Write a protein that binds this DNA or RNA. Sequence first.
RNA 1: GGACCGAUGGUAGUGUCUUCGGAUGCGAGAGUAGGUC
Length: 94
Amino acid sequence: MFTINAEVRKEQGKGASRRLRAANKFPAIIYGGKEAPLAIELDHDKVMNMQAKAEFYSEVLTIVVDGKEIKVKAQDVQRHPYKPKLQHIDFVRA
RNA sequence: GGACCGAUGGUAGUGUCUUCGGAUGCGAGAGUAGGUC
């Protein structure tokens, strides 16, 4: 199983964007709920290998937010503009 | 070749504090997911 171990976050307003990049982690979201989504901090070099196969977007992944296991499927992964990296990824509530 | 509208999160952008060096915020538009008819 893929399983993209994250942790829940709400510091998105830039505080997250500077701690995540400060440790080579990288933000995501878990949307298409009905009440609201869920932003989660995860490893870039992990999720890199993960959306790097079609099974990741075509099949569900398990976001283990600090040990809590959330089913979601990738719906908009954003690549870097020239580098072989990512800008952001989302998943939708599987 | 359903139509219309379109969040959160993202990155673009933008401050604030400040002995000006340093530190630290908030974050589009468009698309997506969804809503409405």
